[PDB]
Symmetry: C2
Amino acid sequence: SLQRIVRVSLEHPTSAVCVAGVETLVDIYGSVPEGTEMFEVYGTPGVDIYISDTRRWRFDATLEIIVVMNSPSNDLNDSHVQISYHSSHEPLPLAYAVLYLTCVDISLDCDLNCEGRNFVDKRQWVWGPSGYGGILLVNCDRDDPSCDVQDNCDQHVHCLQDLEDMSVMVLRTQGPAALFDDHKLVLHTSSYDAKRAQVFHICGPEDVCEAYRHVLGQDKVSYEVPRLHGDEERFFVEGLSFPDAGFTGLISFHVTLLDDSNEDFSASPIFTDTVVFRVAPWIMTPSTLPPLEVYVCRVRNNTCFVDAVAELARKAGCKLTICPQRWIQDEMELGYVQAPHKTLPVVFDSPRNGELQDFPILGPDFGYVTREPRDRSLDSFGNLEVSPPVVANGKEYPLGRILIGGNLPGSSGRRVTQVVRDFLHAQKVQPPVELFVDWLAVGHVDEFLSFVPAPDGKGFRMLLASPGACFKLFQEKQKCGHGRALLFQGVVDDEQVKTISINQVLSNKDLINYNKFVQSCIDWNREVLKRELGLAECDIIDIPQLFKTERKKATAFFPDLVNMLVLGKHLGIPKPFGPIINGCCCLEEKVRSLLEPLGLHCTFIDDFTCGTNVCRKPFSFKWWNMVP
Amino acid sequence: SLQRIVRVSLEHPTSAVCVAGVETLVDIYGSVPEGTEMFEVYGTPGVDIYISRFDATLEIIVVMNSPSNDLNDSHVQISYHSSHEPLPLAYAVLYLTCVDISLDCDLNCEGRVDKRQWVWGPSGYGGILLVNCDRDDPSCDVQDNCDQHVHCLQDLEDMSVMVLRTQGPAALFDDHKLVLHTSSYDAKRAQVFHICGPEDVCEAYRHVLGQDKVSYEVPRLHGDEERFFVEGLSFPDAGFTGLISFHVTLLDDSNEDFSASPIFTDTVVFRVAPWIMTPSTLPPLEVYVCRVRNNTCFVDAVAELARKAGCKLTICPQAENRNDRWIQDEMELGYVQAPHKTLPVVFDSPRNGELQDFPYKRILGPDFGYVTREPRDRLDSFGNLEVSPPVVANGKEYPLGRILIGGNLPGSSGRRVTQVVRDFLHAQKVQPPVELFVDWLAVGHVDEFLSFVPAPDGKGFRMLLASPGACFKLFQEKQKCGHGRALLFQGVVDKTISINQVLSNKDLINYNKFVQSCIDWNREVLKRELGLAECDIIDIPQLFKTERKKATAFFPDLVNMLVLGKHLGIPKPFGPIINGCCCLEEKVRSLLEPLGLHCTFIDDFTCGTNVCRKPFSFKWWNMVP
Ligand SMILES: [Ca+2]
Ligand SMILES: [Ca+2]
Ligand SMILES: [Ca+2]
Ligand SMILES: [Ca+2]
Ligand SMILES: [Ca+2]
Ligand SMILES: [Ca+2]
Ligand SMILES: [Ca+2]
Ligand SMILES: [Ca+2]
Ligand SMILES: [Ca+2]
Ligand SMILES: [Ca+2]
Ligand SMILES: [Cl-]
Ligand SMILES: [Cl-]
């Protein structure tokens, strides 16, 4: 309703400004003429008058007059309302009161992203399919081909491609120009919001980068808008901060009309319109999403690994980037930000000191984000993974759920710094899950947990390392007369690492009992994952994997099978140098019998003789349609 | 829901611990004996066994409901048989020790249960924690929550109780550790003392969780129940939603060669009670005034009004850092409330110095807490801060009222309320603030044009708005009756003006029309955000003049009154004297006395007044924000 009160006087005609579609209540300042018993209200064409007027003579009471104008005025004071006060004793009216009106239309709008929900409250941002609201990206992608830092570090536009990342804000003002000579039009935002976004007002041709004037920014919280382009001014909004521990992700911009007609008095508010943007969060891509680019580091002695990765990537049809030497898999994670107008892959760099090949990856349409710890004296993103879309606890996680290696209550050190946990939780669209990894020497999630695509059941199957599975496999192979088959029969007379037989493995009671303890450690996480991801036993696959002891913690006995490179249907699995039976590794044949029915192709790669990371396509599901 | 997996082996008997009422799934580590199989499961008394017998991918589930008396005093035996021979193929044994572990608090349940959540509303639940900011110790000079010790037994009356109940064989806890822990973030905002000796000894309450203590191995000294006392350190703020969690975790440390493993975890979630403002319609308990030299008459009138009411009166001394009206502008009086204790709490305006709010017991003393903030930049006057009675608006209900904050006009250079204060007030979440337009005033305090009084009719209150139009009407009507020669400021013993001269000053009348429009903007904002109608509002006649092109009171501000129940102390308007009475006083009387209120007009020009009030009967945890 946004109702408004305007007072008229008997001795002077008053002049006021109203906004189209806004109810204006006409009251009196001072007494009515002595003797008033009835009143009449008349208005010029275009002025709708209500009484809480066709019937002119109206009895006097504590009743309100409401005037409405629906179309903006062409000239100042081109319309008016006249109240006539009469007495029942005399035919001549007691007095006249005049309210001249100027009607204006003011609207601050953005792309509310409306295809399933209209004319709703522009001051809110609603999640879900029936939601709406502008979306703002963090301009963290360095589009300028002659700049060394991110595009949102300065207060200027230095390339026209940069505008593709920004969001558009349109200010429509319909009215007589002379009015805006003494009625100021102020675009403003809060200081808090000012430190997290910037606004450029376009003032010349679009071709000119210098025409995009920095209007709202780090210290600019208000700006008087000159109406240079007639009835529409254009602003470009540029995000500066992802959602964080203290930043819910909402940023507001307002336009306020201020009456400054009288230089002796003070300014006064007349109308205010608001737009609310939500900063798009950083979203992780699980291994079930289609790949676009694989990253590898060719060092000395790893040529075979890089070659096998290149062969797998060409068999999958995705790009491959050989990186010079930091760490491809542990010092960075690859996600994306998504807005209706542009999607940007974004690298989350592990907190360190230096620009180390991730900042110098950071190029056009490829953004960068990182954090700085509180105690600058680290984080390994091998403790960080994400699940495919799931449904659990009656809730739906269509972008999956983040999986973070946790710390055991009472442990001395922390495995993930507080800044990273706060960032991941603040993204709000992939609610994290704590896992139990302190039993591992390193503690990375991919040492016991992975996901692969499948056509049956849900879109995926969860691979869990299982000492019990390998125990069963070796027992069955021994019962079949293959107990003398040797593990690690890779290279003889040219590489000196002793071999071991199935009999020797099954006879080592310490090894079997320790792997039973490891199996229980993995069973804890198995139950936690079944609960937090809504999984059943048919969703899980126990991949045979044995562990040994290092510093009283768990390490892989043979290469980690669960830690594979997933590229669509193509799997690059670390080659297990297991028992050779009939000319084949029984571990390879077991993994094949487990995975190939799912339509996946298994290529076993020697990573024993690294670093691999994948940029993937975003979810088809739009994050703004999720209900957190 | 909290299912657990335990694996048995054919060659070694396994031993495990289970928690009462928690399903433990029994699986096999390794192969079953070679050949066609069937299995039988039997369990000792106290062991409930279910099956979800032919062999398939089917699960065995074991449950124990009562804790064990001895280690491994119960067991489950799986027997593998073949259909070809009567003799069983093999046996697998799982010895079990059942334990009951529970970390609990007073969940505040009389109208309603997941212990890991905190739910608002009448159908809600959850523990409540106060901020121990009240200085109960008569020999400490600072707040009670500054150290890591308990120095007086009355301090425990502010804390919340956390009970850890563990039923099981003692020998188990020789190799199964019991760890009470909380997050670092939560650790910096609460403290936990574990009681270890007699309650009489303050030194027996040992600091176990605090600023840097995030975990603690608890020794079971008192049998099956240990008690902890939780003490809040921080109100909700911009980055603190107000929730604090504590967990107990059982850790298997049986094998020194392996690493520890989790077994069970229970959680308690506390909500820190917010700071709540008290509107003028609430019953008073204590009035505060500052007696200086030459202002004795004002203090006397306030004392007489407080004696006419049933509340206490405190004469406050003035320190070196002196704002003129420091009783009302440098401090606000609210409260925090938990089912076990209610504390009045003074919000001290952010400044430099300890000035009678921090030192002296009538404000910061036993069962009277203190809270303040420090600005980030280089300002705050709590005259820009008020609060409304309980209201209903926008389809929502505000049973603790809504805070009203004087706002800044878009484009203004300075801010009248710093960001820390706005963040604090918004974080309290139970009195959602409303921004007002006050930049038209020279000072800009809310009480320059707005007030509330109790009423028996309607919503229980009336909103008083200063109105130049009302005074205009009053003076015009008095002039029509032949009283235009009546003089304002006649009863003055220190410059008189007549009704005719006031009505003849066209600049003054136009300026007061502009002021009336400025107040009308706020009137519409308040009608919208508080669900008010015209019958809820009263236009108190008030004229304004210009100072530095801003609005100041022409005669004393009538709206800025002291409300004590039915008794009103209104600033005396030295208006036109007619028939021996001030027509402004008679007008205010005709407006207010029908509401059952008593009007005493007090000369405060010839100050500072503040009121501590009774808390709302409505409990804040029953509100749904
Ligand atoms: Ca730029
Ligand atoms: Ca850019
Ligand atoms: Ca850095
Ligand atoms: Ca771009
Ligand atoms: Ca990772
Ligand atoms: Ca203490
Ligand atoms: Ca205390
Ligand atoms: Ca201070
Ligand atoms: Ca106390
Ligand atoms: Ca106040
Ligand atoms: Cl790409
Ligand atoms: Cl008291």
